[PDB]
Design a protein around this ligand. Structure first.
Ligand SMILES: Nc1ncnc2c1ncn2[C@@H]1O[C@H](CSCC[C@H](N)C(=O)O)[C@@H](O)[C@H]1O
Length: 206
């Protein structure tokens, strides 16, 4: 998925001298890559004690300067604003519209004026009835309808196979969440390769 990574790095653009906050950072893969492209500062946040422990361990192996915090994005307080916030596969862990809105509000509160959010999530549009994504390597096992989205149980065709639950919020739910948070504008980023897929989201503060 080169164009996914390309779009992701295109969505972020130039990071030279930019402060980056990596939300749902895991062991800090993405923030670390932006550290090597000349980010002035990188901070990582994840809700998992396990992931942040492994992140700090990896930073030791790399001898990098990256700061890691255990926090829920919905109520995190770093007492600092950043040029760029990355939130790849964070928002489909939001179990409610209120939680989704909490997360966007928290992102906005940590953005410098004219700062941008770069996100990637399960396509808001996707409905099971349209067709399953076996070809893409993602098996949709169950669909539970929510007010303004769906709960999807997804099996990734791996060995062993693993089952993930996505809260797939529709475009309108996202638009309202982005609006309430006080973003100036945003757009959906959906690349098309020549010779089911996840969607990018870029949001700019005034
Ligand atoms: N409310 C929340 N706040 C912060 N991190 C969260 C969260 N809910 C889930 N996460 C974290 O989100 C991560 C998703 S997997 C890692 C995603 C990573 N940004 C990437 O693109 O590769 C998990 O590590 C999980 O612990």
């Amino acid at each position: 998925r080169k164009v996914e990574v390309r779009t992701l790095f295109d969505m972020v653009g130039d990071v030279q001298g930019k402060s980056v906050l990596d939300l749902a950072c895991g062991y800090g893969y993405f923030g670390r890559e932006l550290y090597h492209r000349g980010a002035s500062k990188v901070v990582g946040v994840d809700i998992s004690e396990k992931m942040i422990a492994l992140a700090k361990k990896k930073s030791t192996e790399y001898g990098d300067n990256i700061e890691f915090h255990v926090a829920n994005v919905s109520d995190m307080q770093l007492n600092e604003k950043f040029d760029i916030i990355t939130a790849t596969f964070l928002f489909h862990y939001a179990k409610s519209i209120v939680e989704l809105e909490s997360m966007f509000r928290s992102v906005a509160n940590h953005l410098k004026p004219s700062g941008k959010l770069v996100a990637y999530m399960a396509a808001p549009d996707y409905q099971l009835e349209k067709g399953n994504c076996h070809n893409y390597g993602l098996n949709i096992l169950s669909e539970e309808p929510l007010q303004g989205g769906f709960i999807h149980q997804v099996e990734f065709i791996t060995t062993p196979p693993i089952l993930l639950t996505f809260y797939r919020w529709d475009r309108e739910t996202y638009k309202n969440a982005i609006h309430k948070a006080g973003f100036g504008h945003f757009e959906w980023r959906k690349p098309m390769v020549l010779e089911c897929m996840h969607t990018g989201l870029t949001c700019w503060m005034p």
